Amino acid sequence: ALWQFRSMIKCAIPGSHPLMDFNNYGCYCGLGGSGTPVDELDRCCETHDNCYRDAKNLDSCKFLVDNPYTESYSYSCSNTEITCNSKNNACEAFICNCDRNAAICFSKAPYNKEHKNLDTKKYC
């Protein structure tokens, strides 16, 4: 679920303000995303977006009947480390995995302040 994805961003990036930081960044961090991603951080978001589309297509997720952000999973934070709990059923695990990789992705890419809050209609 969305709140769990934010939780993971805070786990991976302890002092982060995930909504402040990564909503409205680039062409892809935010609802939707078109165009060429502007950088590594943006490409993380595009990957997340792709992953969710792939979850919606997943046979295991066939009873998912809204947005993967509405699907809860079980996860744990351990000293900066995220673990998708092994108990998760298949759809929950796949979506927890989407989020966890994006979280780790966020923590490794450079943050470029100028890429934040783009006029996506002119540049994406």
Add this chain to the structure above:
Amino acid sequence: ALWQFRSMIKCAIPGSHPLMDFNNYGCYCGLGGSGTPVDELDRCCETHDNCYRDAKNLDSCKFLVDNPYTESYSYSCSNTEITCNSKNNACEAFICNCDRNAAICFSKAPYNKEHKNLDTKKYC
């Protein structure tokens, strides 16, 4: 901006995990929204959605081509009381007031556990 709405809610509602309880609630607390709101709280979300639609059609917001969640404004919190700064220019003032109106509304509307994470495809 959406991160500000998140802190507005934490202001009016001390307990609060905004993404956790208010997101994916009823037919209108979450993305889009169609259908008949399922309770007063759900109407708080419907009303905010409409405020945002208003915000995009408001002449003072004409240079805001994105979505109002990406518009930053200036606000304050004291004693669970929300302040939209006098120094907001008109769009920002409007959007801040949509967000303040909603957070207050959330704070007085009953939260009905059984309306959380509704099958919107089925029920909205």
